[PDB]
Amino acid sequence: GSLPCDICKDVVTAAGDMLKDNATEEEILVYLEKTCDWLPKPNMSASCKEIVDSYLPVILDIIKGEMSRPGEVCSALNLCES
Numbered sequence: 001g002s003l004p005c006d007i008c009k010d011v012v013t014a015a016g017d018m019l020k021d022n023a024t025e026e027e028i029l030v031y032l033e034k035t036c037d038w039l040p041k042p043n044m045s046a047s048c049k050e051i052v053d054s055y056l057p058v059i060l061d062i063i064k065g066e067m068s069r070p071g072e073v074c075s076a077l078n079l080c081e082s
């Protein structure tokens with residue numbers, strides 16, 4: 001998906017790191033949404049926030065299982081080429 005794929009992978013990486021830091025699921029949601037502001041253009045930051053809102057909760061459920069790396073997780077969600 002290019003951008004949606006790139007964003008998905010950054011999200012999965014960040015979520016995993018925060019979970020290890022004992023962050024709550026809401027703190028992760030709040031933080032990734034704010035990190036989306038690092039994307040240089042308003043439209044890109046906006047699409048990043050929608051991906052975070054739409055996928056972070058399911059990503060948290062997925063990574064509690066056997067699959068936890070960005071590539072494998074984002075390919076499963078079909079945000080990155082299978």
Ligand SMILES: [Ca+2]
Pocket residue numbers: 037038039
């Ligand atoms: Ca900024």
